[PDB]
Design a protein around this ligand. Structure first.
Ligand SMILES: [K+]
Ligand SMILES: [Mg+2]
Ligand SMILES: [Mg+2]
Ligand SMILES: [Mg+2]
Ligand SMILES: [Mg+2]
Ligand SMILES: [Mg+2]
Ligand SMILES: [Mg+2]
Ligand SMILES: [Mg+2]
Ligand SMILES: [Mg+2]
Ligand SMILES: [Mg+2]
Ligand SMILES: [Mg+2]
Ligand SMILES: [Mg+2]
Ligand SMILES: [Mg+2]
Ligand SMILES: [Mg+2]
Ligand SMILES: [Mg+2]
Ligand SMILES: [Mg+2]
Lengths: 159, 207, 290
RNA sequence: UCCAAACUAAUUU
RNA sequence: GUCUCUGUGGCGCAAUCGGAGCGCGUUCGGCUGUUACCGAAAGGUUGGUGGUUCGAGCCCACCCAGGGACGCCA
RNA sequence: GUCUACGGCCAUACCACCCUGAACGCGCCCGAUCUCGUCUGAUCUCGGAAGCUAAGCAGGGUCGGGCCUGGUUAGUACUUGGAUGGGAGACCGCCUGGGAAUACCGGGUGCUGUAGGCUU
RNA sequence: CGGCCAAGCGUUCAUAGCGACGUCGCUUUUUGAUCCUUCGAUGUCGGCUCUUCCUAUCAUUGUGAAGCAGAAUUCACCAAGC
RNA sequence: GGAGGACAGAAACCUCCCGUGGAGCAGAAGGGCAAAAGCUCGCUUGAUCUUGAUUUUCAGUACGAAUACAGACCGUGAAAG
RNA sequence: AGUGCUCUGAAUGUCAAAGUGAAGAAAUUCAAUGAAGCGCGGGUAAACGGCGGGAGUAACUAUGACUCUCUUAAGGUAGCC
RNA sequence: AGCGAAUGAUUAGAGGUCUUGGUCAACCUAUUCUCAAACUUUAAAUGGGUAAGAAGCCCGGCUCGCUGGCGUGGAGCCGGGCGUGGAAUGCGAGUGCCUAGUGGGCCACUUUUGGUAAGCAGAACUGGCGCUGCGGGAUGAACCGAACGCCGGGUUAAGGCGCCCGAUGCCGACGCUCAUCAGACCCCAGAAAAGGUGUUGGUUGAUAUAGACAGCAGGACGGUGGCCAUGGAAGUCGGAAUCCGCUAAGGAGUGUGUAACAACUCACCUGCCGAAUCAACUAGCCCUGAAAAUGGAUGGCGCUGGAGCGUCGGGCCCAUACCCGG
């Protein structure tokens, strides 16, 4: 039976990358976390206060509370039969803004830019992105050359 | 006595080398890995014949030095005391274990065993043994490696390499690279001298 | 050789450099981490710090707040611009530290327009003073001191620029323990010893000392005061005339210059083509020499 | 009334 | 298998109290006609190998050479 | 063209060695009455301005070492799914999709924000 | 209980008879290992008696080999009739 | 580690140079750490008084331990803290 | 020596209830005083039971009368196997 | 994957030369062989999380005792305006109460731990058996196909189609193989190393009408026997040898087992014989290797121009599955 220790098996998870030891870069301290934005929870090893438990390393939740040094994140956790939402307090060394949301905020700012300018050209522009259609018909020039013949090579034995 | 060798033939356990953890292994039976005139240069002992395993298995250290011996005294007897250099290219690093039994605790209670010997885990295509000789002894290196096969459990193939000696450069291009100083013979092997670096090593190469 | 080289190839494959501004020896990232960083619930509020740096011939004083892009300087006041106000010389002593901190404050408060609201301590006592905010007005500009890598012992000139900035009207949390008039064995602050360091009286005494004992080292220690004719007995008023000239007109106006060409004063990088024929004619002229 | 044991095989009167 | 335990001068064996010894023997003077007694000197990888430590023969981990003790329903 | 102060990303920026550095600056530098420290004014602190780019620093250089980035390695190794595939086995082919790492061979050698200089 | 390889032994001579260092198997009369069956019970060692089966042959019939002169002996083959 | 310096040597102390952590941080191992989390000085008692929330084990109960706050009183520092 | 059993009871240490003394408004509390027993001291094995190791040594060898030693309450005697 | 990258483990030469090593090591530098569950610069496949709107977006204002240079910053509140519903595919969803039985499991593919192994012990992932019949595997909890109301018709799956036994009673296609223990279909119910001038393929190399190969043989071996030695030299050998025939090409011996001048004509041939041949590999089937006890098991009978093995075609046979119908 394994131990129920708080850092059991975090030999590589909470370690540091190679030649990225030492002083934390200072711009991880001057991000701004509003309430209700999506953060990625990772967890450094250089800072021991306020680190999340290992079951949250690599999860993603939204911010509900903001303190002097920390944050309150609502994270889904799949315990055995059901997913329940956990409220965890993490110092802000261990998190970062998630770019999974920001492509969606890139196109909501792109769609309102094109709905009040759609009508006067009679344009019904496409907004729903579609899942990669099959390739259309086209022509392929040989340019006078002929295609190179390929044939399998004989076997030989080295290693 | 040791167990019969079909007990420890297939690579079933994860590699268990001797370390801080597995203490007190017996020493391996094979201790000498190179043999013949070891101090022979690279310049004119050009043929290299290999022994390649066809199976994924593990070979005991008793059997590595049984084929060390039986291929030595054939090469001694027919290519002279110094007309060859053989090299065993497997080290017995994996440690096999034994569960000794029969006032201890009987049965499979406490079954993790004690270290008993060492084997070398070998793969498909992996070279077991190499011999370098004169070019006119191709008949005898094929015979000495054929007589070392009968000492090993699985299946092996005998193969004459395309490289020069124990080097990694093809024998078709070896003399041209020595001539144009792309290679430099130091000892048994050869140094590759690339076209980058500080230019004083170019100057001493072309003194 | 005989010894193992420590700086081999495997030494450099595993070497992590420190930060660019650490290995220049300019920034303490331990202190900066506690100084430029705002509480996360005071979200986009700035956190201003007064940056006092003393070179060998100048005193830089500037207020900055931190951004992800780099620090943003809001106001900066130098000490080599004090001869415009009438201090020709001694431009790095304790007195010009006060004048630079005073100039930095008054240049900031009219930049914001609060200059007549917060006047500061006009008559220099040298005693403890704190600007307190007035209800119904804008608050006092609250700022913190970044001494840097300086050893902050009692009498250090960075507290002179602090004392000038408090008297200029800024709100800087400080104590009087590191002003020059503090007495460590009594834990007592004088405010008259400290007042004379603002007026340059420690220098004025040493000028009168070298006049009456050496007179040849006097021309050596104070060769530029003699050229600008700065008598010891005219000096305390020479800063009083200077401080009022600061409060008269703290605005920094600057002159542009245009008539410059594109003269390379250094040397550009050699191209790849110039590099690999240079070796080709080194290899040629080596074989041609044998 | 303190303790106090032993003594060449090497021979010639 | 597991747990304790011993190892020290030629011999039996101390100190287990982190800061090298008894008895006997062996040399060597004496006494004696000549071989107990009297006097004095010498002698120790303190099993081995690493640890810990201000510091180890004393405390730790292992190896060895020895011992001892713990098991029974067929 | 370039520096200073404060930075951001933290080697394309580091290390060794050589060469050049106008003007500003930055430095080395000169001194110990005051402030403040020392076994020692060397460091630290303070007061200066005779000297100097020697060194730091900057720019350049090196068939340089590292580092960053491409090629090869290689559709290789491995791998998801599949078969009443093969083989005594160990293991191995094929189908269906994914897809690396050295050695080896090239290229590169800091970008940049805020404030303030200098360069005719 | 057998096989393969062949350093050696066999005055000479690897292999008549052998066979180190290796390595590949078979068998279920051993014992370990396991715990599938039986605890509303399968009488539990040996000897005695009696039958049948196996061959991995001790002898006998027919053979081959030898370091088989004869004699005795050893090694193999077909073979479990007796 | 190197090179030097009366006695002084394989080890005493002195000095310069190299030194990306190869040391140390009470202990097991793992992670972290260099104008530091190390070593040395100065001042101290935040090892104190409180009420909730959260995490970890998990039934998502308790203990234990731990993390963010908030209210007091305090220490230290020029100050940010 | 152990475990018992037994004798002795000296100033004996420990030691209950009652009794005595003091403190207190009282319940109560404290102190003094101390029976047997235990502890201390003898005796007792035809009581229960118990009754060692290690070295060296005779002039062929081998043995070991003798010698030295750690050691315990004694170290197994006459016998017998 | 890596180790000419740190930490460990480790093989060999080479180049340097300082010295408390005695030319040797040690040492250093550049290489080189082989490793790692409790090492790693690097680094997949499969995987884990979040997102893909009206609970949004854009406008104005208001509140605050929090924050504060500032009309700041933050949260809240109130109006007003915007539907192309902002990937695919499928689907009705939400929520409460009460509650039984269970808490001995076992098996299989892949990953995996202990063990020589086990129809052994212990995990992961999914499916199954337990709870479940049916067709197929002769027989079988678990394999393969497919899951079940009571029937008719049709058609399939896995598997089959000599006879048992439904279906090849095809003028089926091309080969391989002879076994005096043949072989014969997932799981699965029997074999290995090593061999075979057994046959059939293949790979590489070599010789050949300036005539090989195999067999008869025609001048068809000698001063030099040297050197090695009178334990083996004017035939032939357990130690280092090693030129020459006065030739058309020739021994200091493979060859008549040898202290012997013992003694016979191989070797190398140009005419005879006159056309192809030799060797080493390799892998198909078959054989040797291959021995246990009641008499016996491709299921049986049997089968050899196949009813065996390999690659294939057309038909055909039937499940409770699929389809149409009651
Ligand atoms: K019994
Ligand atoms: Mg500081
Ligand atoms: Mg002793
Ligand atoms: Mg009993
Ligand atoms: Mg100085
Ligand atoms: Mg310079
Ligand atoms: Mg210069
Ligand atoms: Mg380079
Ligand atoms: Mg012999
Ligand atoms: Mg079981
Ligand atoms: Mg019965
Ligand atoms: Mg019966
Ligand atoms: Mg037989
Ligand atoms: Mg007796
Ligand atoms: Mg059941
Ligand atoms: Mg299937």
């Amino acid at each position: 039976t394994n131990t129920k220790g708080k850092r059991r098996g975090t030999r590589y998870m909470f370690s540091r990358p190679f030649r990225k030891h030492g002083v934390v870069p200072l711009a991880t301290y001057m991000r701004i976390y509003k309430k209700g934005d999506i953060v990625d929870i990772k967890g450094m090893g250089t800072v021991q206060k306020g680190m999340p438990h290992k079951c949250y390393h690599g999860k993603t939740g939204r911010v509900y509370n903001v303190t002097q040094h920390a944050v309150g994140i609502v994270v889904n956790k799949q315990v055995k039969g059901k997913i329940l939402a956990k409220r965890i307090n993490v110092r802000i060394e261990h998190i970062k803004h998630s770019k999974s949301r920001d492509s969606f905020l890139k196109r909501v700012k792109e769609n309102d830019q094109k709905k009040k300018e759609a009508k006067e050209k009679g344009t019904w522009v496409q907004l729903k992105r579609q899942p990669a259609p099959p390739r259309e018909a086209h022509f392929v020039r040989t340019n006078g050359k002929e295609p190179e013949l390929l044939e399998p090579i004989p076997y030989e034995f080295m290693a | 006595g040791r167990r019969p060798a079909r007990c420890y033939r297939y690579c079933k356990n994860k590699p268990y080398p001797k370390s801080r953890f597995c203490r007190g292994v017996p020493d391996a039976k094979i201790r000498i890995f190179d043999l013949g005139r070891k101090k022979a240069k690279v310049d004119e002992f050009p043929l290299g014949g290999h022994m390649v395993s066809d199976e994924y298995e593990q070979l005991s250290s008793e059997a590595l030095e049984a084929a060390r011996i039986c291929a030595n005294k054939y090469m001694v007897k027919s290519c002279g005391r110094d007309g060859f250099h053989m090299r065993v290219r497997l080290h017995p690093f994996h440690v096999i274990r034994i569960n000794k039994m029969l006032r201890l605790q009987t049965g499979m209670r406490g079954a993790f065993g004690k270290p008993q010997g060492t084997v070398a885990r070998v793969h498909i295509g992996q070279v077991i043994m190499s011999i370098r000789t004169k070019l006119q002894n191709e008949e005898h290196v094929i015979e000495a490696l054929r007589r070392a096969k009968f000492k090993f459990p699985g299946r092996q193939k005998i193969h004459i390499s395309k490289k020069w000696g124990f080097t990694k450069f093809n024998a078709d291009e070896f003399e041209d690279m020595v001539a144009k100083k792309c290679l430099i013979p130091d000892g048994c092997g050869v140094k590759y001298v690339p076209s980058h670096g500080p230019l004083d090593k170019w100057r001493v190469l072309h003194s | 050789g005989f010894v193992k080289v420590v700086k081999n190839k495997a030494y450099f494959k595993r070497y992590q450099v420190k930060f660019r501004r650490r290995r220049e020896g300019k920034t303490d990232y331990y202190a900066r981490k506690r100084l430029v960083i705002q509480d996360k619930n005071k979200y986009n509020t700035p956190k201003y710090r007064m940056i006092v740096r003393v070179t060998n011939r100048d005193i830089i004083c500037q207020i900055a707040y931190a951004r992800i892009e780099g620090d943003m300087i809001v106001c900066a006041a130098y000490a080599h611009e004090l001869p415009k106000y009438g201090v020709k010389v001694g431009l790095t002593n304790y007195a010009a530290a006060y004048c630079t901190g005073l100039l930095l404050a008054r240049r900031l408060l009219n930049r914001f327009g609060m200059d007549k609201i917060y006047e500061g301590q006009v008559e220099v006592t040298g005693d403890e003073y704190n600007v307190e905010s007035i209800d119904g007005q804008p608050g006092a500009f609250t700022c913190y001191l970044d001494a840097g890598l300086a050893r902050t012992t009692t009498g250090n000139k960075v507290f002179g620029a602090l004392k000038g900035a408090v008297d200029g009207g800024l709100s800087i949390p400080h104590s009087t323990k590191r002003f020059p008039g503090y007495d460590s064995e009594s834990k007592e602050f004088n405010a008259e010893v400290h007042r004379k360091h603002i007026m340059g009286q420690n220098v004025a005494d040493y000028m009168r000392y070298l006049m009456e004992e050496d007179e040849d080292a006097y021309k050596k220690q104070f060769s530029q005061y003699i050229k600008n004719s700065v008598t010891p007995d005219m000096m305390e008023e020479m800063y009083k005339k200077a401080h009022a000239a600061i409060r008269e007109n703290p605005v920094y106006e600057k002159k542009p210059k245009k008539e410059v060409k594109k003269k390379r004063w250094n040397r550009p990088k050699m191209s790849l083509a110039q590099k690999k024929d240079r070796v080709a004619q080194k290899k040629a002229s080596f074989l041609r020499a044998q």
